[PDB]
Amino acid sequence: DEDETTALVCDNGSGLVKAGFAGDDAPRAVFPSIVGRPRHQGVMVGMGQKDSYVGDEAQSKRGILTLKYPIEHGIITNWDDMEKIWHHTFYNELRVAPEEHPTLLTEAPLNPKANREKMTQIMFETFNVPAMYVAIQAVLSLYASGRTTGIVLDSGDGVTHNVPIYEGYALPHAIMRLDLAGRDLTDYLMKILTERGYSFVTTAEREIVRDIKEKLCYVALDFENEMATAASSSSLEKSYELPDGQVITIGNERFRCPETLFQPSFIGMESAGIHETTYNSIMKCDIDIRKDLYANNVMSGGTTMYPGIADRMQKEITALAPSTMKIKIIAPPERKYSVWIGGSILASLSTFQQMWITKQEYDEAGPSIVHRKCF
Amino acid sequence: DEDETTALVCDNGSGLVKAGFAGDDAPRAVFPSIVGRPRHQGVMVGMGQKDSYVGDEAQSKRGILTLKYPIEHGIITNWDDMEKIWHHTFYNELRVAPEEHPTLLTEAPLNPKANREKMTQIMFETFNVPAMYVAIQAVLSLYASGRTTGIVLDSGDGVTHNVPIYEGYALPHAIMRLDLAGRDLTDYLMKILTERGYSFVTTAEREIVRDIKEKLCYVALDFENEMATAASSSSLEKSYELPDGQVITIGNERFRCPETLFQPSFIGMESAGIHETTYNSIMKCDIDIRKDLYANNVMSGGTTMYPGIADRMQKEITALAPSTMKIKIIAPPERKYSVWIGGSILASLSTFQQMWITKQEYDEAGPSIVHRKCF
Amino acid sequence: DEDETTALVCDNGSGLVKAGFAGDDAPRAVFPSIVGRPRHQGVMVGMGQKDSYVGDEAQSKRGILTLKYPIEHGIITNWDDMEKIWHHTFYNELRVAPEEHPTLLTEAPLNPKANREKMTQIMFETFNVPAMYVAIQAVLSLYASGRTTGIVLDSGDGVTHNVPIYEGYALPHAIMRLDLAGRDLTDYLMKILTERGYSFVTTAEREIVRDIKEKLCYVALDFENEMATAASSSSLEKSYELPDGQVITIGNERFRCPETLFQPSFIGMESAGIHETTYNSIMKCDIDIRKDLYANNVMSGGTTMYPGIADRMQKEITALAPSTMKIKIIAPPERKYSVWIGGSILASLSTFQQMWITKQEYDEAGPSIVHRKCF
Amino acid sequence: LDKYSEALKDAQEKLELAEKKATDAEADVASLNRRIQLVEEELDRAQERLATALQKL
């Protein structure tokens, strides 16, 4: 339905897929990274009913479906479900057939190689895309935020890569990859809501807790003092309407969930938190770089939308940082959508038009070409 | 259990601590330089369980411990953890109380002064050792390796020191201390093992990567040709058994990590590599010294235990060296143990008995005495 | 564009490069003698970023660059990088192409011939300068000082020259050229600060140490009394602010590093030191020429800004010198810049217009002409 | 709903603009504080160098 052969951008996270065309300032549509399947025996004849549901279909019919995510901690393992999501995304809802448009995909720099190789293979072999480019989230986040220099701490759904960039250059020895993300924060919340009498264990229940989290949780700039009153009074609780007419309120669980970002030990991870990893990515860069990265701490990914996160992270780094240095956080409304936006920016830059793999080079080399041409 | 007041000898790095008695040719025990701490909440009672674990205790119970070491790039910053390591080392495994035995500790020639000063203070004030002597690791390496002249290439867990000695004398202006070491190789290997799909982010995982490196990795003589086949076929992969029964196969990563020694840029280091660095130590020495240093490049410490390293270093150094001149590398089986062994030798030599700080001179002057009495 | 086609004047040292036009009393700009190159992989596109940086560009963007110096111990070893420096120095910054102006460069009178020949060759063949003249640095120091008689001791970053000049004549048999200089003082300070617990090895670290030296170091006219207190008390320490907000304090090391000019053994050099070489430049001249050289010790070049150097250079000479005789140090504000200033003075003399190599004579004879026409 | 949604897109746009104004104003509070400290530091240094120049005077 587009009137120009622009590139397509599709940000396939472990959570949701943001997609639209290159050159825009927003995805045109957002689909979950989900393929749903019925977990019940059909009773009635002539009811239609699919073997599998894709994207928004999977959530729309979720009452009797188990919902699976093809991408685990940022890596695609179920390429067949990815192809279903992409076909739906590109042909039914975004109305852009990849055959007529080059496509840009996104991923952490330490995302295992199979991710970038398989994504490249599917767009060239099942979609016949004329060209491909797998982009890095740290690059995409600095473009979206208007920076060339800074720390990208993407507190997304899958894995946090924590990658410093200076004057457009990677500083790879200072990358701190952390096995903590929004999906784990949600899981922690489900266990503590169980402690309060609200047990959520099935798919519909899990998707609901994620929605509750997104609307009710906040980080708190002082966990212990906030907990001292949240755990003592209803005055710090917030309600949520459950789809069936029941209601839930959340107390210290409201902040304990995001607290795992500062205390990963809450989910069994051996880590001091996202602010220590951010601190180390600044600290491990050269001494003449450190000052610029302290002043350009970039929050990206989702979870950046928990109230107070932009401020607590500046406080936590300031507390670790040397005096004299300016510590500053960048946290635009283009949060959580920053990787997709960076994709749009990058795909359409004149400086990027030589970075695309065409469907010539691809067949001569095979999908492993992504490791030579993209990253 | 000893029939003489033989000196105790310990070689303490960021990796492991080797300890035994003077006059022997191997340590009596080896411990990681680690004090372990539980990272989980105890649930059962009457389970024993320590607040902290030391050395092999820390390693045996590591499944639930965070493991920290007191030594960074050759310097002890956490004396409390070294005090615990030494108490265990001396009293439980060596079965000796230092009060009745003088002690020899070691450090690199350009190691910050606080190391030798604090080590001297702890052995005299918490262990009541009758005497102390902090040795030069390069001296100990030369005795153990059968040389008086040469370049000591320790390439250890902390730093590579690259120090030339001629006729038993230091040539300090030519020491090329380099921030390239075994601990960086462990970090590099896990990043490239992440590329293969195996995540190693916790302490137990870190120590496993260290064990993988030690058993599977090598440098060989020609990186590009070795990579051409390692990157093309499974025929150059080797399986490593992970503790849970699963395996990891390692391909060109098997050498790409070790290659960092020749290409330090792999870990973000501004360096030409160990062969050029060795060469520069020789080139900064007078021409009537150089002939003996070229013919006597001597390996000590660790990482010198990679297959192909003595032979590649000879090739890489002779390629930089003047023609006619004979370039040779000494790489004895006393590898990884040679600094400790040299400690045993220096302590057993009659030529060294006047070099000890007594616990008289020590108390009259304080620990700063080490800078007048040792080197 | 200029009022007159006067010579461009530029003093190219192993440290700094300075330039301006003949007839003024200062260079327009000072650059480090540096060509910088990225040591990192770029990831963002359209970030500008040069393949190589020159002078102040190289230092300003140094966070991700490795920085090289084309000049060592007074000579150019990398003429390609000097070509880049001269283009930047003369055309990009003074805004004058050498094509339309004579150029005056400088070199020590015992400076290896290849360097005075290469400077002549590049300015004539790559810049098409209409004329050349490579100045004697000692002469320029005398022109700036207002002396015709004295010992010019230029203690710069590269080499200490030590040349006796009487009534405008050199006494070449008495020149004590010495390979002891400010660059060694910087590296010694990196190593001594490592001993204090503040390691420095990389380019950024070296530039910090050069900045520490330039702001905190001194010679001390009586170093024994100065170190007796400085090595005993914190009241003699001075704090320095590092680029990332760290603070380093330096005590007796603050003057012990500069002390190497009198005590060369600190860096492994076999030398009598700068005060004895001044003495011998005087003493090796005839007795009717020494009575004037003793009274005229001419200080020039950089490192001359350390407090105590003039008094320390006069006291030591006085101690070596015969009694009755008056020993005097001349240490003008035109320090470090005295060679450039003298260059301006030489270039504007009416009698100097007969000293130029024209771009005619140059091509007929080739660059060896510098030894027929300049010195 | 359209009125609240529109009142919201407008309160929200005015907010993004006010937040932007604050972000940019803050970018300038910070750029000004950097210049103030750079200039105050140059001033203190001018005064340190003045005290030194006066001492050297």
Side-chain angles (χ1 to χ4, degrees):
Chain A
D1 290 342
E2 296 294 327
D3 57 349
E4 179 60 293
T5 56
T6 183
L8 306 180
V9 179
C10 182
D11 183 9
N12 296 280
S14 67
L16 294 99
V17 180
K18 294 175 175 54
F21 57 85
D24 204 354
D25 294 316
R28 300 302 295 179
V30 180
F31 307 86
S33 295
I34 298 173
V35 177
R37 292 182 172 88
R39 68 182 185 84
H40 289 266
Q41 172 66 56
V43 82
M44 298 185 77
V45 176
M47 294 300 293
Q49 305 301 313
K50 299 182 185 293
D51 55 296
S52 64
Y53 295 81
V54 60
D56 53 305
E57 292 177 341
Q59 289 177 322
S60 294
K61 298 291 185 178
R62 69 187 179 273
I64 57 169
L65 306 178
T66 184
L67 301 184
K68 303 296 185 183
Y69 292 85
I71 300 169
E72 182 176 7
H73 299 294
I75 181 162
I76 187 72
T77 62
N78 186 336
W79 74 267
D80 191 68
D81 287 347
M82 179 179 71
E83 192 274 334
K84 289 179 177 64
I85 292 167
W86 286 352
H87 186 271
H88 177 69
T89 295
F90 293 128
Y91 290 88
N92 292 334
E93 295 295 320
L94 297 175
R95 307 290 175 82
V96 289
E99 187 172 40
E100 297 180 1
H101 302 278
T103 300
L104 184 148
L105 305 176
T106 67
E107 83 178 47
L110 296 175
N111 193 311
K113 285 179 174 173
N115 193 65
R116 61 189 65 167
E117 186 173 318
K118 184 59 63 177
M119 289 190 298
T120 299
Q121 183 173 38
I122 298 304
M123 289 304 297
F124 282 116
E125 296 181 28
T126 67
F127 292 94
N128 199 29
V129 72
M132 291 293 289
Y133 190 79
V134 179
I136 304 305
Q137 288 169 314
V139 170
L140 296 171
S141 293
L142 291 175
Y143 278 114
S145 293
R147 296 292 186 275
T148 64
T149 301
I151 304 299
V152 178
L153 191 299
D154 181 329
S155 297
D157 192 78
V159 63
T160 300
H161 58 294
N162 195 37
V163 178
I165 298 171
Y166 179 85
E167 294 284 320
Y169 290 89
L171 303 171
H173 64 284
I175 296 172
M176 303 295 110
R177 185 176 65 82
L178 175 65
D179 288 341
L180 174 63
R183 188 180 293 183
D184 298 305
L185 299 179
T186 300
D187 187 72
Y188 185 76
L189 182 60
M190 292 174 73
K191 290 182 177 67
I192 64 177
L193 293 178
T194 299
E195 288 184 350
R196 293 292 301 272
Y198 287 85
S199 172
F200 296 91
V201 299
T202 68
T203 293
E205 291 172 347
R206 170 195 79 210
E207 292 293 303
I208 292 166
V209 172
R210 176 181 58 77
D211 192 68
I212 294 167
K213 180 191 73 169
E214 289 171 358
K215 293 183 175 74
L216 274 65
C217 292
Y218 66 95
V219 312
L221 270 62
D222 185 325
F223 177 75
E224 293 77 8
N225 287 339
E226 193 71 17
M227 180 173 66
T229 61
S232 297
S233 178
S234 66
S235 67
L236 277 82
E237 292 186 345
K238 179 74 178 177
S239 66
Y240 178 91
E241 179 184 341
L242 297 170
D244 60 358
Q246 295 187 94
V247 299
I248 186 167
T249 63
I250 301 178
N252 70 19
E253 306 86 18
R254 192 171 173 202
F255 44 99
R256 51 175 330 149
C257 169
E259 184 65 16
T260 299
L261 290 171
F262 298 94
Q263 294 186 68
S265 69
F266 282 17
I267 60 167
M269 177 64 206
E270 186 183 354
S271 176
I274 63 169
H275 60 291
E276 184 168 315
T277 59
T278 297
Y279 183 75
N280 288 341
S281 291
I282 295 166
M283 182 182 74
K284 296 291 186 181
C285 294
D286 286 355
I287 194 162
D288 287 313
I289 295 174
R290 296 186 178 161
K291 74 185 199 297
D292 295 289
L293 296 175
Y294 279 117
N296 296 279
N297 182 355
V298 178
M299 297 301 294
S300 189
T303 78
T304 54
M305 302 302 290
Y306 284 109
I309 189 65
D311 297 301
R312 183 168 172 181
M313 285 295 288
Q314 189 174 286
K315 180 179 177 181
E316 290 291 356
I317 298 301
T318 299
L320 299 174
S323 69
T324 301
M325 295 295 102
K326 174 67 178 177
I327 298 92
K328 184 171 173 67
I329 293 176
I330 299 167
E334 275 156 21
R335 291 193 297 274
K336 105 209 248 178
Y337 296 86
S338 63
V339 172
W340 184 89
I341 292 167
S344 179
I345 62 100
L346 180 60
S348 294
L349 297 175
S350 67
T351 60
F352 184 72
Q353 298 303 306
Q354 301 302 310
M355 293 301 294
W356 286 99
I357 298 167
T358 64
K359 191 176 189 295
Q360 180 64 47
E361 292 171 306
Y362 174 80
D363 290 305
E364 292 175 1
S368 68
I369 191 168
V370 71
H371 305 302
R372 281 99 75 186
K373 295 290 188 176
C374 295
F375 190 83
Chain B
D1 295 341
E2 297 289 317
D3 56 347
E4 181 57 291
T5 58
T6 187
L8 308 182
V9 179
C10 300
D11 188 24
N12 304 285
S14 64
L16 297 100
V17 178
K18 290 179 168 65
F21 294 81
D24 208 323
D25 66 347
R28 297 283 172 87
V30 59
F31 308 90
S33 57
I34 293 175
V35 178
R37 274 143 190 123
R39 72 182 190 86
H40 294 86
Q41 173 66 56
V43 76
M44 300 184 75
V45 300
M47 297 292 104
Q49 304 305 311
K50 297 180 179 178
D51 57 316
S52 63
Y53 297 80
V54 60
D56 54 305
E57 292 174 342
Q59 184 174 19
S60 292
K61 299 292 184 179
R62 68 186 180 272
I64 57 169
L65 307 178
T66 188
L67 304 181
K68 304 294 184 183
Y69 53 87
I71 299 168
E72 295 183 356
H73 300 291
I75 180 162
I76 298 164
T77 62
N78 184 338
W79 72 267
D80 187 69
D81 285 345
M82 286 304 301
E83 197 272 333
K84 289 181 174 69
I85 292 166
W86 287 340
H87 187 272
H88 177 65
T89 296
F90 291 129
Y91 290 87
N92 293 332
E93 295 299 316
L94 271 58
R95 298 171 61 79
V96 62
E99 184 176 1
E100 296 181 358
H101 296 260
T103 300
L104 188 151
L105 303 177
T106 68
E107 71 177 35
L110 301 174
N111 195 296
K113 286 178 176 173
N115 191 67
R116 69 170 81 176
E117 186 174 324
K118 184 59 63 177
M119 291 192 294
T120 299
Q121 183 173 41
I122 298 303
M123 289 304 300
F124 282 116
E125 296 181 28
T126 66
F127 293 94
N128 298 313
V129 72
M132 290 293 290
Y133 187 82
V134 179
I136 299 167
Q137 289 175 306
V139 167
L140 301 184
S141 294
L142 288 170
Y143 285 117
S145 295
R147 295 292 185 276
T148 63
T149 301
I151 307 300
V152 177
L153 305 172
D154 52 337
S155 300
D157 196 83
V159 299
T160 299
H161 206 75
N162 298 305
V163 43
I165 297 172
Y166 181 87
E167 289 282 335
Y169 296 77
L171 303 172
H173 64 283
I175 297 170
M176 298 296 107
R177 185 183 66 81
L178 175 64
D179 291 336
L180 177 62
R183 186 65 67 176
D184 298 307
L185 290 168
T186 299
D187 184 73
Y188 185 81
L189 181 60
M190 67 178 72
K191 288 183 171 67
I192 65 175
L193 296 178
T194 299
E195 290 176 356
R196 295 184 69 74
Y198 291 76
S199 175
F200 297 90
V201 297
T202 68
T203 294
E205 291 170 347
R206 170 194 85 211
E207 292 302 313
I208 292 166
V209 172
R210 174 175 73 70
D211 195 68
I212 291 168
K213 179 192 74 175
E214 289 171 357
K215 292 183 175 74
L216 275 70
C217 292
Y218 63 91
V219 297
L221 273 60
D222 183 326
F223 176 78
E224 292 76 10
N225 287 339
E226 191 69 20
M227 181 174 67
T229 61
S232 297
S233 178
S234 66
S235 66
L236 277 81
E237 291 185 350
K238 177 72 178 178
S239 297
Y240 174 88
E241 181 178 348
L242 300 170
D244 63 354
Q246 296 188 92
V247 300
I248 183 168
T249 65
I250 301 174
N252 64 8
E253 298 86 359
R254 193 172 175 197
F255 46 97
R256 285 161 59 198
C257 172
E259 184 64 15
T260 300
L261 290 173
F262 292 89
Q263 301 186 59
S265 67
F266 284 19
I267 58 169
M269 179 64 200
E270 188 186 359
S271 174
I274 61 170
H275 57 293
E276 184 168 347
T277 301
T278 298
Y279 175 76
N280 286 337
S281 290
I282 295 169
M283 293 302 289
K284 296 294 185 181
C285 297
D286 290 347
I287 65 287
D288 287 319
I289 296 172
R290 290 181 184 175
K291 74 185 199 297
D292 296 291
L293 296 174
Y294 276 120
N296 298 280
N297 290 305
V298 53
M299 292 180 169
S300 189
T303 75
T304 54
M305 294 296 288
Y306 283 123
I309 195 66
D311 294 296
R312 182 171 173 185
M313 285 290 281
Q314 183 181 40
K315 181 180 176 183
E316 291 297 319
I317 295 167
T318 195
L320 298 174
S323 65
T324 301
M325 183 60 70
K326 174 67 179 179
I327 294 84
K328 178 173 179 178
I329 296 170
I330 297 94
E334 283 86 4
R335 342 208 254 211
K336 114 205 245 189
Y337 299 94
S338 66
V339 174
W340 182 88
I341 292 166
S344 180
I345 293 168
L346 180 60
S348 71
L349 288 171
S350 67
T351 61
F352 175 69
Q353 300 306 310
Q354 69 272 32
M355 293 301 294
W356 288 102
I357 300 166
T358 65
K359 191 176 191 299
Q360 181 64 48
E361 290 173 312
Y362 173 81
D363 290 307
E364 291 174 2
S368 68
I369 193 168
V370 72
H371 301 296
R372 293 174 179 83
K373 296 288 186 175
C374 293
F375 62 93
Chain C
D1 297 297
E2 294 292 321
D3 289 346
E4 180 59 292
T5 55
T6 66
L8 298 176
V9 179
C10 182
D11 183 11
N12 305 301
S14 69
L16 303 173
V17 180
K18 300 191 300 296
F21 296 97
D24 70 350
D25 202 33
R28 173 63 185 82
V30 53
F31 307 94
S33 298
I34 298 173
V35 177
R37 293 179 172 87
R39 69 184 186 87
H40 290 267
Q41 174 66 56
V43 295
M44 300 185 76
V45 298
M47 298 292 103
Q49 305 303 310
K50 296 176 178 172
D51 54 291
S52 62
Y53 296 83
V54 59
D56 55 305
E57 293 178 340
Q59 189 178 54
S60 294
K61 298 293 185 179
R62 69 186 180 273
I64 49 74
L65 305 176
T66 180
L67 303 182
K68 304 295 183 183
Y69 289 79
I71 297 170
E72 181 176 356
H73 296 296
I75 62 170
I76 299 167
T77 63
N78 184 328
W79 68 267
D80 188 75
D81 286 346
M82 286 304 300
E83 182 169 351
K84 290 179 179 65
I85 291 168
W86 286 328
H87 181 75
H88 183 67
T89 298
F90 293 121
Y91 182 75
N92 290 341
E93 294 285 307
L94 301 181
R95 312 300 296 172
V96 180
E99 183 177 2
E100 295 178 354
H101 290 253
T103 299
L104 181 64
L105 301 179
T106 37
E107 51 92 66
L110 300 179
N111 189 272
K113 287 171 75 177
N115 186 53
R116 67 185 77 181
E117 290 174 352
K118 185 60 65 179
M119 287 189 286
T120 300
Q121 182 172 42
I122 299 303
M123 293 307 298
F124 282 118
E125 296 182 26
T126 65
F127 293 98
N128 297 311
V129 70
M132 288 291 289
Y133 192 89
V134 181
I136 299 168
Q137 288 171 312
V139 169
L140 299 186
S141 294
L142 290 171
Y143 279 138
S145 296
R147 303 285 168 162
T148 58
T149 299
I151 306 302
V152 179
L153 195 151
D154 56 350
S155 293
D157 191 80
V159 65
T160 299
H161 200 61
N162 300 301
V163 54
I165 300 172
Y166 182 84
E167 293 287 327
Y169 290 81
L171 289 316
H173 66 283
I175 297 169
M176 300 297 107
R177 184 170 67 75
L178 174 65
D179 294 327
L180 178 63
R183 186 176 292 181
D184 296 303
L185 297 178
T186 299
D187 287 342
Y188 184 72
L189 184 61
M190 291 172 75
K191 289 180 181 178
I192 205 166
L193 296 178
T194 299
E195 290 180 352
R196 291 182 66 76
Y198 294 79
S199 295
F200 297 91
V201 297
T202 67
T203 294
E205 289 172 339
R206 184 171 287 105
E207 293 299 303
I208 292 168
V209 173
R210 57 157 320 168
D211 195 65
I212 291 168
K213 183 186 79 174
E214 291 172 7
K215 293 183 174 74
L216 274 68
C217 289
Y218 67 100
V219 173
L221 71 90
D222 184 326
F223 78 94
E224 290 180 346
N225 288 337
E226 191 69 14
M227 75 187 288
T229 300
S232 297
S233 177
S234 66
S235 67
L236 271 284
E237 292 184 348
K238 178 72 178 178
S239 297
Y240 173 87
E241 180 185 342
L242 279 82
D244 58 357
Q246 292 182 74
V247 177
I248 186 167
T249 65
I250 305 172
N252 58 298
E253 304 88 353
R254 188 175 167 202
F255 61 89
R256 186 174 175 87
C257 294
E259 183 182 336
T260 301
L261 293 173
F262 298 87
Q263 298 293 309
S265 67
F266 292 178
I267 59 169
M269 179 65 191
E270 182 184 350
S271 175
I274 70 96
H275 58 292
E276 186 166 352
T277 58
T278 302
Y279 171 72
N280 284 330
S281 292
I282 296 166
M283 202 67 179
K284 298 293 184 182
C285 296
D286 290 348
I287 65 288
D288 286 316
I289 295 161
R290 287 194 221 141
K291 80 168 200 305
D292 296 291
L293 296 175
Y294 277 117
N296 294 274
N297 294 312
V298 178
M299 181 174 280
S300 187
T303 79
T304 53
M305 290 206 208
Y306 289 127
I309 188 65
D311 300 296
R312 177 67 186 279
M313 98 158 305
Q314 186 179 287
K315 182 179 178 184
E316 290 288 357
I317 294 165
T318 300
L320 294 171
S323 66
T324 300
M325 181 60 70
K326 173 67 178 178
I327 296 89
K328 170 71 177 175
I329 189 69
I330 301 163
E334 290 80 3
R335 30 206 202 178
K336 120 200 238 180
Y337 298 91
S338 62
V339 173
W340 186 90
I341 292 166
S344 180
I345 186 167
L346 177 60
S348 70
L349 295 174
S350 67
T351 57
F352 182 66
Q353 305 310 310
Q354 300 301 310
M355 295 296 289
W356 291 107
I357 298 166
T358 65
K359 190 177 190 299
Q360 180 64 47
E361 290 173 311
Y362 173 79
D363 291 304
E364 292 175 2
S368 67
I369 193 166
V370 70
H371 194 63
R372 293 180 179 87
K373 298 290 186 176
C374 296
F375 187 72
Chain D
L1 185 152
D2 286 344
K3 288 189 289 186
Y4 279 119
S5 181
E6 291 170 355
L8 174 60
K9 79 181 173 64
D10 292 339
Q12 189 66 49
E13 180 63 10
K14 287 185 287 185
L15 173 56
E16 291 300 316
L17 293 170
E19 186 65 19
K20 293 179 179 179
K21 182 181 168 176
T23 298
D24 290 343
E26 185 64 22
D28 286 317
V29 170
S31 76
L32 267 289
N33 280 330
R34 288 193 297 273
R35 182 182 65 198
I36 292 165
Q37 293 303 303
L38 289 167
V39 176
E40 286 179 7
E41 181 62 15
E42 286 292 305
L43 175 57
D44 286 346
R45 289 174 183 179
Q47 293 297 109
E48 289 169 349
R49 290 173 292 181
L50 176 60
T52 299
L54 292 171
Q55 186 272 320
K56 295 295 181 180
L57 174 58

